């Protein structure tokens, strides 16, 4: 590179025209051979580990030897050889991985598949199928005996755990939490129950349980936390207007008979809904 | 500072009201009372150590608290500052640890509550039980590492439930309700799933029996059968010997699997033979004897119904059982002298052959092997502690990720402090462990050290 | 002569984790279009007859196992 010191135009032309092209060709050939040999014998997880090892070695050696400019192109070629060529095999097995997951294993899917442009969107759809289906197990198993308590905690636990999984593993990619919202919104509103808007009216029932005095009751500070968590469910619910019409009716009965345990609690209840929808809703 | 050490109640009231009159009199009294209570509680808790009776560790503390609260109600008018100071002082007492020694306090409380719930504690009325446990939760309020106690109580509860050793399901349901108010539903969700599965197993057996009666062809299994159906999500039985089931149980296994496939489609069953026990009847002796043995022990006994003398290779081939546990089972059977070892060597080897003991005599026609589940092995507690440590690692990684994402930019000390705030109730974390988790998350490219300052961290995504 | 055996059953990887792989409905409730008929298949997998019929007419493959279900 130093021989062409004084040339004003294209100083690196000799470097690229004498060295870079054969190096790229032979490194591509070598990594094609290594990828084929590894795929012939290795297991999916083992192949996953070994490709990461090779990609870690490449950066070190390329930093050791070549020009500072040529890191990116060599790394890109190495990436385009291993993961890109066998991308379809990785997509095929991903189904079993997500349904029952190993924290380390399916995590590396995100790292590898992030480099290739086309691979990533397949995974995000597969998660939605699993996460929504799990929520259905939570709902369809619920007993009609005591409905109000079941919805509030169950969907939150489904939401909470999947929030726990997504950020600890997938580097919390924005698109991914979008998949969280869409599937969760679908779950909360179903047509299978005979009564339409069965869940939204049951929210008032849960509020009605909190509307009662309940002298042998829990701490009002944590009651707000339940309401704070309650609003999180409310956003996923479509028919917000139906809730307001029902809620005022039982609120009126609670207020007229003094069934409410404390007036301050209702004021916070009004206050929290204001930031949720507000205006005519409040 | 002197007059608190030896105090006069009238003098205490006078000085207290006078200090309340002045603006700055209180803090010295508050701090000195906190220190005195701390030292007194440390003396009280250090009085006894390893005397085979764990209730003292609870009871004494109760008394001390009670005494102090009486005083704080009597002459101090129950000022909230003194309440908070008493809470701070009592916090250290329970969380006291010997140097290089882990805190056994959660283990002691778990042992205490388990002992109260075990049928070994007879003559103890349920109202007194719930009063003692109401005191127990009050003591528990001062414990920091709730997760260790949670894991230990989960294991003990599973052990009690699988063998039906509890007082009554109402008692443990009241306990889980009390714990849920104490630490939130999440702390008790797995235990609630445990109780729900325990309740459902009866109806599961009922439906299985109904299917048995409803089969097109009447099937005589030849054995009396009872099975329990367990979820993988809450049961702490994650360990998985290529043991071979005896042929007598194959018919029942196949028919029950067909039942479960027909009634619960797509559910893949897994057999924990080492936990399965059963009733065996010896008739070759002068009297018919009855033994309560595990499936592994039963398989060795049934291997003798065809031959009076069986070699070690024959038993290992028939059962396909690994050497360590097979040797353990054979030694356990030899301890009861139901079999005689035909080799003069005390050690059981591959060439060891065993003969049926036609001269076996027992004081009881029906007998049992003592449940070692009540027995504690030092390895089990260490494994539980290691599992809790791994769970803490994972949860601290999670907390770091959530805080970093929520702020989208933050300092090192601020992340540490917010992790401290989030996990203080769940357990006591450590700064070095937090730094280790931060390093691990950096390695996996969740976060990256800010280019402006390595003490600031930025979300990679 | 008489033998009694107590056993524990452990289950995982349920089909009711996903219920119908065809539709977003329970293994026992009604289908999307219907909302009736529990049609067991030799594929050892349970799906609604309306689900399996519609998603077998368009594609003879079973999505879960990537093969033919009946
Ligand atoms: Zn369906
Ligand atoms: Zn239908
Ligand atoms: Zn099938």
Author numbering:
A (entry chain F): 189 to 470
B (entry chain A): 283 to 522, 525 to 745
C (entry chain R): 23 to 57, 68 to 102
Could you pull the original sentences from the published paper?
CRL2FEM1B is an oligomeric E3 ubiquitin ligase composed of CUL2, FEM1B, ELOB, ELOC, and RBX1. FEM1B is the substrate recognition protein of the oligomeric CRL2FEM1B E3 ubiquitin ligase that has been implicated in sex determination, apoptosis, colon cancer and Alzheimer’s disease. Cullin-RING E3 ubiquitin ligases (CRLs) are multi-subunit complexes composed of a catalytic Ring-finger protein, a cullin scaffold protein, substrate adapter proteins, and a substrate recognition protein. Here, we describe for the first time the cryo-EM structures of oligomeric CRL2FEM1B in three different states as follows: unneddylated CRL2FEM1B, dimeric neddylated CRL2FEM1B complexed with BEX2, and monomeric neddylated CRL2FEM1B complexed with FNIP1/FLCN.
Using conventional single particle analysis cryo-EM method, we solved the structure of purified recombinant CRL2FEM1B to 4.08 Å resolution. Protomer 3 was partially obscured and requires a lower contour threshold level to be visible. A single protomer of CRL2FEM1B in the oligomers has a conformation similar to CRL2VHL with the notable exception that FEM1B adopts a different ‘elbow-like’ fold. In addition, extensive hydrophobic interactions are formed between the N-terminal domain α-helix of FEM1B (residues 269–284) in protomer 1, and the C-terminal domain ankyrin repeats (residues 546–588) of FEM1B in protomer 2. Thus, the C-terminal WHB domain of CUL2 (661–728) and RBX1 in protomer 1 form a ‘forceps’-like conformation, ‘clamping’ the cullin repeat 3 of CUL2 in protomer 2. In this way, the ‘head’ and ‘body’ of protomer 2 are completely fixed by protomer 1. Furthermore, the loop connecting α-helix D and α-helix E of the CUL2 cullin repeat 1 (which was not resolved in the previously reported X-ray crystal structure), appears to bind the C-terminus of FEM1B through hydrophobic interactions mediated mainly by Tyr125 of CUL2 and Cβ-Cε of Lys469, Tyr472, and Cys521 of FEM1B. By using blue native PAGE together with glycerol gradient ultracentrifugation and MP experiment, we obtained evidence indicating that the trimeric CRL2FEM1B disassociates into a dimeric conformation after neddylation.
